[PDB]
Amino acid sequence: HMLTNLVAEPFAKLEQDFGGSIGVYAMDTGSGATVSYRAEERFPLCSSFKGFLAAAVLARSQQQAGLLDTPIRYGKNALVPWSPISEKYLTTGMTVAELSAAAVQYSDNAAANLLLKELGGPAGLTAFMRSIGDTTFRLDRWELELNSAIPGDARDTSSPRAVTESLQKLTLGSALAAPQRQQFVDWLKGNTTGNHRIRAAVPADWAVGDKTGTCGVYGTANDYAVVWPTGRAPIVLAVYTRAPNKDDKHSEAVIAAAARLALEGLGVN
Numbered sequence: 001h002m003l004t005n006l007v008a009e010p011f012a013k014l015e016q017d018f019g020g021s022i023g024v025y026a027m028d029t030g031s032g033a034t035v036s037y038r039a040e041e042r043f044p045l046c047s048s049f050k051g052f053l054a055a056a057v058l059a060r061s062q063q064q065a066g067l068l069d070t071p072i073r074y075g076k077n078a079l080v081p082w083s084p085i086s087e088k089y090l091t092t093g094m095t096v097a098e099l100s101a102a103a104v105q106y107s108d109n110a111a112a113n114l115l116l117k118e119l120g121g122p123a124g125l126t127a128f129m130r131s132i133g134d135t136t137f138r139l140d141r142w143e144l145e146l147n148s149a150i151p152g153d154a155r156d157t158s159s160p161r162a163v164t165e166s167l168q169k170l171t172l173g174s175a176l177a178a179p180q181r182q183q184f185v186d187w188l189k190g191n192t193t194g195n196h197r198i199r200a201a202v203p204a205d206w207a208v209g210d211k212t213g214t215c216g217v218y219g220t221a222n223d224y225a226v227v228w229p230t231g232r233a234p235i236v237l238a239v240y241t242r243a244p245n246k247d248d249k250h251s252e253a254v255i256a257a258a259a260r261l262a263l264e265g266l267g268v269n
């Protein structure tokens, strides 16, 4: 409900200092009050699709009772860069649940590609997002090609608003069965890669689950989170960045600052 104007000028100054574009959408699930800045624009997902990927696996698990316990074996050629958990279990395999936890909590790339294969590829994950009423999300490619973050390329993008809307449906709404919903929340709460992003803007006595993304080019990186402040309804928010030049660097500090401004706009402690 507006609230944006409490912080439209501060956001424009932050992105002028960063040297690129910042996109924010934050929802107070209590009042329905929102904060929006470039909330409709497309930004590259980078690794952030891995949280939605885990949610799609959990949705499939509601239909296929054995799915999460299924052992998956893989070869050395599956171990693309940034596979910190799957590289330790090459010789043993891992379960679908373990791959899902690795994809969410360590951004594990081999795990992400193996679970994409289970869902029928990038189109399969896109299909799941359409099934919960997200018409904006698109995944087009696999790891690592989906990280190209080419300016104006809609492949492998979504909008901050669509990301927040979908995250709310999956973590707090009715898109997942209750046990699956709590598993998704617990995976996000256990994320290890987000300490310098939205988490850096959240007090220690508030619960938070998040999923990061970092493309490594074009100043492109992001984070989305559900935050449970004490004594009020949860907040859902998405913070995405990009920049014009290929060797522009992302900034975790800019993502934490954007998160702070969003929470300040919502009037949150």
Ligand SMILES: Cn1c(=O)cc(CP(=O)(O)O)c2cc(F)c(C3CC3)cc21
Pocket (backbone or CB within 6 Å): 046, 047, 048, 081, 082, 106, 107, 109, 143, 144, 147, 193, 211, 212, 213, 214, 215, 216
């Ligand atoms: C540079 N970088 C990070 O610095 C950090 C993560 C973890 P996340 O922030 O994406 O979750 C990272 C993940 C990746 F898949 C990639 C591939 C493009 C090469 C790069 C990453």
